Every structure is written in structure tokens, then in C-alpha cells.
């Protein structure tokens, strides 16, 4: 168990558990769940309506002081009724800690823009909108950031195909670059790698 196994830290685990309990007690209106991962990573699941309060409390509270937003992104899980999972990562320099705040939304429900709380979010929320199609309410200048001008659809969504729907080429008759339906000389070859034998008993799900 010594040489090749990653060592544990129970002190940080206890501190993060206590602080998660602290946050949950202070904001019962929005906090739905609190988790401490095995490698000491605090996670706080909330209600979407509490995006702005929670973050504000987390960045302003004397005992919190998470004044820096590492990054903000989204995860697509099609099996969930609320497709998109919004993940905020925050860093506290005063207490040398990190915290993760997660909420959910679907295709037609906006999330409150948090540019007011953190200036850094601007481009992160633009990127989430571009890649996933999640609208952010009250956003200063919301528009595509990564994709091409006039590009239809959101690439990061699970349903979207890897190579998309159109390609580009230069056409001499019209003397310009044109977009046409994708044709591939060699199709991407899909591999089935998943082993039919279970790897991790600790994560086994009930047999329904």
C-alpha cells in the first residue's frame, strides 16, 4: 500500500467537510448537496436560482474569501432531464483552498450571468453558450467566441457529430470559400473498447 498508492490526507478532508457543513447551514435556500471527494475536493450542489447569491457569499464572506474564479464550464449528460451541468471552480488565496459549485439547466432555461460577481466569467459564459447553447441572462455581450461566423449548432453537445455537418473548400467558379455537406475520404473508425467484465466493485449500481 506504500510505494505505488497515492497517500491520504485526513486533516484536509475534515477541514473541507466542516466548511461544507458551514456553507450548507448558512444558505439552506439553495444548497442541495455537499460532497468531499476522496482526494480532498469539496463540491457543493445548488439550485440554479442561487447561482448569484451563493457565489457572492463565497467571494465576499470573511471566512470564505474565494476572490478568484479558476474556470467555468459545462458538462452534457443527455440521460438527465436537465441536460447541462454548470461547474464553477473557485480559489481562495487567503485560505489557500479550492471549492467547486455545481448547478443544472436544460436547453430552454437561462442561467443568471455572474459577470457582476466575477469579471472573468464573461468569456467563460460566452464559451458555454457557443459550445453548449446555454443562454445566460443579463450578459453584457453574449455571442459566439470559438466557432466560425454563421456556424449552426453547438459542437460540445453529445448529439453533435465529431466531424460536424459541413466542410470548407475554395471554389474557383464563384472565386471564394464555400461550405458544403461533409464527405469523408476515410470514415472515422469507431472502436468498441469497453470490457465486458466490471473493473470497480466500489461503484457497482443496484440491479434495479
Amino acid at each position: 500500500t506504500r510505494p505505488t498508492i497515492r497517500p491520504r490526507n485526513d486533516v484536509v478532508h475534515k477541514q473541507l467537510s466542516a466548511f461544507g457543513q458551514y456553507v450548507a447551514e448558512i444558505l439552506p435556500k439553495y444548497v442541495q448537496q455537499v460532497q468531499v471527494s476522496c482526494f480532498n475536493e469539496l463540491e457543493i450542489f445548488i439550485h440554479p436560482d442561487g447561482v448569484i447569491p451563493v457565489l457572492t457569499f463565497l467571494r465576499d464572506h470573511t471566512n470564505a474569501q474565494f476572490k478568484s474564479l479558476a474556470d467555468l464550464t459545462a458538462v452534457d449528460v443527455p440521460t438527465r432531464q436537465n441536460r447541462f451541468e454548470i461547474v464553477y471552480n473557485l480559489l481562495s488565496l487567503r485560505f489557500n483552498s479550492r471549492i467547486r459549485v455545481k448547478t443544472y439547466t436544460d436547453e430552454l432555461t437561462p442561467i443568471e450571468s455572474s459577470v457582476t460577481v466575477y469579471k472573468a466569467a464573461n468569456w467563460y459564459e460566452r464559451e458555454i453558450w457557443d459550445m453548449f447553447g446555454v443562454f445566460f441572462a443579463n450578459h453584457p455581450d453574449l455571442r459566439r467566441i470559438l466557432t466560425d461566423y454563421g456556424f449552426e449548432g453547438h459542437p460540445f453537445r453529445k448529439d453533435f457529430p465529431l466531424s460536424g455537418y459541413v466542410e470548407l473548400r475554395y471554389d474557383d467558379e464563384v472565386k471564394r470559400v464555400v461550405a458544403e455537406p461533409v464527405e469523408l475520404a476515410q470514415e472515422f473508425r469507431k472502436f468498441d473498447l469497453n470490457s465486458p467484465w466490471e473493473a470497480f466493485p466500489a461503484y457497482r449500481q443496484p440491479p434495479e
Binding site: 443527455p78 440521460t79 438527465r80 432531464q81 436547453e107 430552454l108 447553447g133 456556424f151 449552426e152 449548432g153 453547438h154 453537445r157 453529445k158 448529439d159 457529430p161 465529431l162 466531424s163 460536424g164 455537418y165 455537406p181 461533409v182 464527405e183 469523408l184 475520404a185 476515410q186 470514415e187 472515422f188 469507431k190 469497453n194 470490457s195 465486458p196 467484465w197 466490471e198 449500481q205
Partner: protein, 125 residues
């Protein structure tokens, strides 16, 4: 504030999929069969959504396998058949669903290999 929308969910006009790949497509919602070359069952736990097979041809150079189907590789994983059906319905795809097939419980008995008068007795072991 809530506005009480009354209609069925429909997001086709927002996804950006060309209409050809919305109307002429058929998806299959199914639990994949166990690979008969192995005994593990871990690949028969989740529901899958996959599209219909389209034309593949031979590249004049190198003889590679060419396709013009953008959804030829897309496979979606769902917890339950209801989630898969809801996803296909809100995306506007015609679907075919297949009920999950489970192996029936079998009555095993080692001692039956040595039956006094039964046909089950093993001629070798």
C-alpha cells in the same frame, strides 16, 4: 415568474441539424446484446441510441472506406429507455424501441450429473 407553456417539447430548430438528417433518419433504442465470445455482462447494463446505417463506398485512391453520413458514428448512452425515448422525441427523430432481453433464471444442480435413472447423467467429466 412562470408562463405555463402548453405544448410538447421540440428543439429541432435550435440544434442546427440539417433537415435531411432530422426527417429521413431512424434511430434504434436498445440494450446491446452480450458478445457471445465472452461471458461478461458489463456491456449489457445501459440503453443505447444509434442511427441507421448509410452507404459506405471505396475510395478510388488507397481503397479506403468513404462515407457521406455525418451520424454514422454517433452512439448515445441512457440510464433508462424512457430517457432515450424522451431525447429522441425532443430531437425529432423517428425511433424504434426494443424491450430489454434478460437471460431467464436456470435451475442448476451438480448432483444431477450422476442421476440414478435420469437422462442427465454425464457420460464423461
Amino acid at each position: 415568474q412562470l408562463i405555463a407553456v402548453d405544448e410538447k417539447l421540440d428543439i429541432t430548430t435550435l440544434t442546427g441539424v440539417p433537415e435531411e438528417h432530422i426527417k429521413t433518419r431512424k434511430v434504434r433504442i436498445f440494450v446491446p446484446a452480450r458478445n457471445n465470445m465472452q461471458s461478461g455482462v458489463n456491456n449489457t447494463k445501459k440503453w443505447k441510441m444509434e442511427f441507421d446505417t448509410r452507404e459506405r463506398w471505396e475510395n478510388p485512391l488507397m481503397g479506403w472506406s468513404s462515407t457521406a453520413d455525418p451520424l454514422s458514428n454517433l452512439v448515445l448512452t441512457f440510464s433508462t429507455k424512457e430517457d432515450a425515448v424522451a431525447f429522441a422525441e425532443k430531437n425529432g427523430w423517428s425511433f424504434d424501441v426494443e424491450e430489454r432481453k434478460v437471460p431467464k433464471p436456470k435451475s442448476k444442480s451438480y448432483g444431477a450429473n450422476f442421476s440414478w435413472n435420469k437422462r442427465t447423467r454425464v457420460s464423461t467429466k
